[PDB]
Ligand binder design. Structure first.
Ligand SMILES: C[C@H]1O[C@@H](O[C@H]2[C@@H](O)C[C@H](O[C@H]3[C@@H](O)C[C@H](O[C@H]4CC[C@@]5(C)[C@H](CC[C@@H]6[C@@H]5C[C@@H](O)[C@]5(C)[C@@H](C7=CC(=O)OC7)CC[C@]65O)C4)O[C@@H]3C)O[C@@H]2C)C[C@H](O)[C@@H]1O
Length: 215
């Protein structure tokens, strides 16, 4: 590929992200003022783990669907054999969900957008997995510190998915070729935007992988 083609890849990854990002960043930021009352919090805390599980599983499944749509629009992803498409989404979709969450997270008050309003980790109490929710909130907290642009998320999450080191891949060389082009697309766009500094500030490789493992 040439540099003009990599620019086309950047714009295309950024486009596919915008068309699949679930909620507009605009709306998410506007709603930061809209916070669950103490009574609303208590309403969530009173629900059984079973109701909370059902709701959360629904929102998660929905988010994963958007991730799958995003991957399907990535260049060459549809050209991969069905086995590798599945391998890559299985290992990487949840990781993408967790990176995308940071757009919906307000570090000023450690709250997250959930079912129309912002709420803290205590909203999820009935699930009885406070270590997990706190680790999910803390990861969003550290990502929010970097002020990820929409295009940085698009390109970074394309790379979370297109990773030739996933076990079980059958056409490893094809995935590699896609990965290298996306790596150069990312580096090149950071240089275009004077954002080279975020490279050293990214989650250490394995952090994201192990947070979704025990999940
Ligand atoms: C490990 C132990 O787990 C024990 O049960 C567990 C397991 O079954 C696992 C089970 O997973 C939950 C849990 O992970 C929490 C999880 O909670 C979900 C809802 C809350 C989330 C914080 C979270 C992460 C994505 C995040 C949502 C909130 C949404 O509004 C978003 C902000 C939304 C938006 C994005 C955007 O850009 O705009 C809006 C899309 C998704 C979103 O990014 C997923 O929902 C999942 C279903 O939690 C149970 C308690 C049993 C044993 O003790 C076992 O040994």
């Amino acid at each position: 590929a040439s540099l003009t083609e990599i620019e086309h890849l950047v714009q295309s990854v950024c486009k596919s992200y915008r068309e699949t990002c679930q909620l507009r960043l605009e709306d998410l930021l506007r709603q930061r003022s809209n916070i669950f009352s103490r009574e609303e919090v208590t309403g969530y805390q009173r629900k059984s783990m079973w109701e909370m599980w059902e709701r959360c599983a629904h929102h998660l499944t929905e988010a994963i669907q958007y991730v799958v749509e995003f991957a399907k629009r990535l260049s060459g992803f549809m050209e991969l054999c069905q086995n590798d498409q599945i391998v890559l989404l299985k290992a990487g979709a949840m990781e993408v969900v967790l990176v995308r969450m940071c757009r919906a997270y307000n570090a000023d008050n450690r709250t997250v957008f959930f079912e129309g309003k912002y709420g803290g980790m205590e909203l999820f109490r009935a699930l009885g997995c406070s270590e997990l929710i706190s680790s999910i909130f803390d990861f969003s907290h550290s990502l929010s510190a970097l002020h990820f642009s929409e295009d940085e998320i698009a390109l970074y999450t394309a790379l979370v998915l297109i990773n030739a080191h996933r076990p079980g891949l059958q056409e490893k060389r094809k995935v590699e070729q896609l990965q290298y082009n996306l790596e150069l697309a990312f580096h090149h766009h950071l240089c275009k935007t004077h954002r080279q500094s975020i490279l050293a500030k990214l989650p250490p490789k394995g952090k994201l992988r192990s947070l979704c493992s025990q999940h």
